Amino acid sequence: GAKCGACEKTVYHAEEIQCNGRSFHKTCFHCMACRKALDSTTVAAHESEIYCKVCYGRRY
């Protein structure tokens, strides 16, 4: 399969969310910056980074 964009562990179709071009665990698809649970339209991804609109509005 693939490997988590967060974990060093493997991602399978079991809990694969493909964001941008990387497979993330459904358990790891939430904000990398804080920890807020993101939804399809609420996640802000830029280049290779994915965060909530709060941390996105923090960094950017």
Which spans of this chain sit near Zn ion (rule: CB under 5 A)?
4, 6-7, 25, 28, 31, 33-34, 36, 51-52, 54-55
Please report, to the nearest 10 degrees, the dihedral formed by the alpha carbons of residues 37, 39, 41, 46 taken in order: 50
User: Measured from the CB of residue 10, what is the shortest distance to Zn ion in angstroms?
Assistant: 9
Query: Which CB sits closer to Zn ion, 6 or 19?
Result: 6
Dist. CA 53–CA 45, nearest whole Å: 9
Rounded to 5 degrees, what angle do the CA atoms 41, 44, 49 make? 140
Cβ 31 to Zn ion shortest distance, Å? 3
Q: What's the min distance (Å) between Cβ of 4 and Zn ion?
A: 3
